[PDB]
UniProtKB/Swiss-Prot annotation:
Residues with S-cGMP-cysteine modification: 112
Family assignment from sequence similarity: Belongs to the KEAP1 family.
Residues represented out of the complete protein: 323 to 613 of 624
Site, as annotated: Sensor for electrophilic agents: 112
Protein name: Kelch-like ECH-associated protein 1
Source organism of this protein record: Mus musculus (Mouse)
Gene: Keap1
Mutagenesis / variant outcome for changing residue 60 to A: Impaired interaction with SQSTM1/p62
Function: Substrate-specific adapter of a BCR (BTB-CUL3-RBX1) E3 ubiquitin ligase complex that regulates the response to oxidative stress by targeting NFE2L2/NRF2 for ubiquitination. KEAP1 acts as a key sensor of oxidative and electrophilic stress: in normal conditions, the BCR(KEAP1) complex mediates ubiquitination and degradation of NFE2L2/NRF2, a transcription factor regulating expression of many cytoprotective genes.
Impact after mutating residue 208 to A: Impaired interaction with SQSTM1/p62
Post-translational modification: Non-enzymatic covalent modifications of reactive cysteines by electrophile metabolites inactivate the BCR(KEAP1) complex. Accumulation of fumarate promotes the formation of cysteine S-succination (S-(2-succinyl)cysteine), leading to inactivate the BCR(KEAP1) complex and promote NFE2L2/NRF2 nuclear accumulation and activation. Nitric oxide-dependent 8-Nitro-cGMP formation promotes cysteine guanylation (S-cGMP-cysteine), leading to NFE2L2/NRF2 nuclear accumulation and activation. Degraded via a proteasomal-independent process during selective autophagy: interaction with phosphorylated SQSTM1/p62 sequesters KEAP1 in inclusion bodies, leading to its degradation.
Modified residues (S-(2-succinyl)cysteine): 291
Assembly: Component of the BCR(KEAP1) E3 ubiquitin ligase complex, at least composed of 2 molecules of CUL3, 2 molecules of KEAP1, and RBX1. Interacts with NFE2L2/NRF2; the interaction is direct. Forms a ternary complex with NFE2L2/NRF2 and PGAM5. Interacts with (phosphorylated) SQSTM1/p62; the interaction is direct and inactivates the BCR(KEAP1) complex by sequestering it in inclusion bodies, promoting its degradation. Interacts with NFE2L1. Interacts with BPTF and PTMA. Interacts with MAP1LC3B. Interacts indirectly with ENC1. Interacts with SESN1 and SESN2. Interacts with HSP90AA1 and HSP90AB1.
């Protein structure tokens, strides 16, 4: 269990960013690691087999605004990025989840197109294949996996921001709606802790949110927990050693550098570190420290 870092890839501040930086909760340190080959905001991160993957996003720069179909793989042992097979379609404001060593890419936008499509990557074959689409088009969608089921939470369908959520059952290649959240959320941080899916922050169409709610997959209810100290949309999120970490985002005024940590036993959030610069729209995941 020792030696794991929280990696943050990409993001946005004035333009899309190429940063890869890693935080060590055990000593408070940050490391700046190899830049992404292509800057991207609105991407997702995940880990399979000790390797960090950056999926989708958009490169917003002074010279263009290009949605990404890319999958790139970072090896901590070499501090190098390598390209992998690209997805069927560009997906900005994507969500991803991992089931049994496979990466699921969910939703996202391509220009004015709001995807319901979903595709699955096989690392051993370096291949993507489309699976059943969601029941709803969703960009800015939060995705997480619990008990080998994939959840897609909130987002924006092209007309309305959403409180709805749905679950993918892989053995039936089928999506079904679940109970909707209490709050409309696009750009929330979504993760899994114990037997619940958490949705933290986001934008409800009017304001960035500090509220946090969790879906108990047995009882099918959403319950609010303690709110974050900061309102935040387009935040990064991960779980590490039984606590939720939220990174950056936008509070309606500032691109935040603060990182907050949720302790479920006390139902409290605390500020634990600051990123090296404020940013939103990052991808976050946990893996071993680099060489
Ligand atoms: C070209 O400029 C960019 C700026 C930031 C980014 S991003 O990577 O951070 N990101 C991608 C993922 C994602 C998902 C949901 C939302 C939700 N919006 C908001 O909270 C929102 C609403 C009103 C005004 C603003 C924002 C916002 C949010 C963040 C930064 C600045 C602002 C801002 O001023 C929503 O639309 O639901 C926003 C994003 C934004 C990308 C491009
Ligand atoms: Cl699978
Ligand atoms: Cl298979
Ligand atoms: Cl595989």
């Amino acid at each position: 269990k020792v030696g794991r870092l929280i990696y943050t890839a990409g993001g946005y501040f004035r333009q899309s960013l190429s940063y890869l930086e890693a935080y060590n909760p055990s000593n408070g340190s940050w490391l700046r690691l190899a830049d992404l080959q292509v800057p991207r905001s609105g991407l997702a991160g995940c880990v399979v087999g000790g390797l960090l993957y950056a999926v989708g996003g958009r490169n917003n720069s002074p010279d263009g605004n290009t949605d990404s179909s890319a999958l790139d793989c970072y090896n901590p042992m070499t501090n190098q990025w390598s390209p992998c097979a690209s997805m069927s379609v560009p997906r900005n404001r994507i969500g991803v989840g991992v089931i049994d060593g496979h990466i699921y890419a969910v939703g996202g936008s391509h220009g004015c197109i709001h995807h319901s499509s979903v595709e699955r990557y096989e690392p051993e074959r370096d291949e993507w294949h489309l699976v059943a689409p969601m029941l709803t088009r969703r960009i800015g969608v939060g995705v997480a996996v619990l008990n080998r089921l994939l959840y897609a939470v909130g987002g924006f369908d092209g007309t309305n921001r959403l409180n709805s959520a749905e679950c993918y059952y892989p053995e039936r290649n089928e999506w079904r709606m679940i109970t909707p959240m209490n709050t409309i959320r696009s750009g929330a941080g979504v993760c899994v802790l114990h037997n619940c899916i958490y949705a933290a922050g986001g934008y409800d169409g009017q304001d960035q949110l500090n509220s946090v709610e969790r879906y108990d997959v047995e009882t099918e209810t959403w319950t609010f927990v303690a709110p974050m100290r900061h309102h935040r949309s387009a935040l990064g999120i991960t779980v590490h050693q039984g606590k939720i970490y939220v990174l950056g985002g936008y509070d309606g005024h500032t691109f935040l550098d603060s990182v907050e940590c949720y302790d479920p036993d006390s139902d409290t959030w605390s500020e634990v570190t600051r990123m090296t610069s404020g940013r939103s729209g990052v991808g976050v995941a946990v893996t071993m420290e680099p060489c």
